[PDB]
CSV table of C-alpha atoms in Angstrom, one decimal:
chain,number,residue,atom,x,y,z
U,3,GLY,CA,6.6,-15.1,-8.7
U,4,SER,CA,3.7,-12.8,-7.8
U,5,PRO,CA,4.5,-9.1,-8.4
U,6,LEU,CA,2.2,-8.1,-5.7
U,7,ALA,CA,3.7,-10.5,-3.2
U,8,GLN,CA,7.1,-8.9,-3.9
U,9,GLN,CA,5.6,-5.4,-3.3
U,10,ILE,CA,4.2,-6.7,0.1
U,11,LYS,CA,7.6,-8.0,1.1
U,12,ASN,CA,9.1,-4.7,0.1
U,13,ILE,CA,6.7,-2.7,2.3
U,14,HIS,CA,7.4,-5.1,5.1
U,15,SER,CA,11.1,-4.3,4.8
U,16,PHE,CA,10.4,-0.6,4.9
U,17,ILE,CA,8.4,-1.2,8.1
U,18,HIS,CA,11.3,-3.2,9.6
U,19,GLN,CA,13.7,-0.3,8.9
U,20,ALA,CA,11.3,2.2,10.5
U,21,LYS,CA,10.9,-0.1,13.6
U,22,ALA,CA,14.7,-0.3,13.9
U,23,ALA,CA,14.9,3.5,14.1
U,24,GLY,CA,11.9,3.9,16.4
U,25,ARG,CA,9.8,5.7,13.8
U,26,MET,CA,6.4,4.9,15.1
U,27,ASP,CA,4.3,7.0,12.8
U,28,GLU,CA,6.0,5.7,9.7
U,29,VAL,CA,5.4,2.1,11.0
U,30,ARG,CA,1.7,2.8,11.6
U,31,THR,CA,1.0,4.4,8.2
U,32,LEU,CA,3.0,1.8,6.2
U,33,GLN,CA,1.3,-1.0,8.1
U,34,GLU,CA,-2.1,0.2,6.8
U,35,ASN,CA,-0.7,0.0,3.3
U,36,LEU,CA,0.7,-3.5,3.9
U,37,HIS,CA,-2.7,-4.6,5.1
U,38,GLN,CA,-4.4,-3.3,2.0
U,39,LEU,CA,-1.9,-4.8,-0.4
U,40,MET,CA,-2.2,-8.1,1.3
U,41,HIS,CA,-6.0,-8.1,0.8
U,42,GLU,CA,-5.5,-7.3,-2.9
U,43,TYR,CA,-3.0,-10.2,-3.0
U,44,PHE,CA,-5.7,-12.4,-1.4
U,45,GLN,CA,-8.3,-11.1,-4.1
U,46,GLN,CA,-5.7,-12.0,-6.8
U,47,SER,CA,-4.8,-15.3,-5.4
U,48,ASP,CA,-8.3,-16.5,-4.2
T,1,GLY,CA,14.9,-19.5,10.2
T,2,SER,CA,14.4,-20.4,6.5
T,3,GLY,CA,10.6,-20.0,6.5
T,4,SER,CA,10.3,-23.4,4.8
T,5,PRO,CA,8.1,-25.2,7.3
T,6,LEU,CA,5.5,-22.4,7.1
T,7,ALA,CA,5.8,-22.2,3.3
T,8,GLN,CA,5.2,-25.9,3.1
T,9,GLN,CA,2.1,-25.7,5.3
T,10,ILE,CA,0.7,-23.0,3.1
T,11,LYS,CA,1.4,-25.0,-0.1
T,12,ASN,CA,-0.4,-28.0,1.5
T,13,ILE,CA,-3.5,-25.9,2.4
T,14,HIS,CA,-3.5,-24.4,-1.1
T,15,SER,CA,-3.6,-28.0,-2.6
T,16,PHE,CA,-6.7,-28.7,-0.5
T,17,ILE,CA,-8.3,-25.5,-1.7
T,18,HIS,CA,-7.6,-26.4,-5.3
T,19,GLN,CA,-9.2,-29.8,-4.6
T,20,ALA,CA,-12.3,-28.1,-3.2
T,21,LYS,CA,-12.4,-25.7,-6.1
T,22,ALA,CA,-12.2,-28.6,-8.6
T,23,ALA,CA,-15.4,-30.0,-7.0
T,24,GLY,CA,-17.2,-26.6,-6.9
T,25,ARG,CA,-17.4,-26.9,-3.1
T,26,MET,CA,-17.7,-23.2,-2.2
T,27,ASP,CA,-18.0,-23.3,1.5
T,28,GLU,CA,-15.0,-25.6,1.8
T,29,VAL,CA,-13.0,-23.3,-0.4
T,30,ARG,CA,-14.0,-20.1,1.5
T,31,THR,CA,-13.3,-21.6,5.0
T,32,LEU,CA,-9.9,-23.1,4.0
T,33,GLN,CA,-9.0,-19.8,2.3
T,34,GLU,CA,-9.5,-18.0,5.7
T,35,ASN,CA,-6.9,-20.4,7.2
T,36,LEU,CA,-4.6,-19.8,4.2
T,37,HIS,CA,-4.9,-16.0,4.6
T,38,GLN,CA,-3.9,-16.2,8.3
T,39,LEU,CA,-0.8,-18.2,7.5
T,40,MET,CA,0.1,-16.0,4.6
T,41,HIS,CA,-0.1,-13.0,6.9
T,42,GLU,CA,2.4,-14.6,9.2
T,43,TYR,CA,4.6,-15.6,6.2
T,44,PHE,CA,4.8,-11.9,5.1
T,45,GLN,CA,5.5,-10.8,8.7
T,46,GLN,CA,8.4,-13.1,8.8
T,47,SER,CA,9.9,-12.1,5.5
T,48,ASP,CA,13.2,-10.3,5.1
């Protein structure tokens, strides 16, 4: 439905894959992007 | 699981936010939106 919600779910899946391989730096950096996108999604949806 | 219980909870809170918006009740909207954001965060963390 929401394009940005899909982008968030996509990021979260890339974070999962990085966790599953033990890639800590990639998890950390992607998490920052997830947080920012989520707060854009709140701005859109508020 | 399916995520449906959490999704339903979020839909319910969103209906109360709409009701507060419809009355122009700003503080109620903003406080309920904080609760909505916290559950949305968990929804995203549980997504596949």
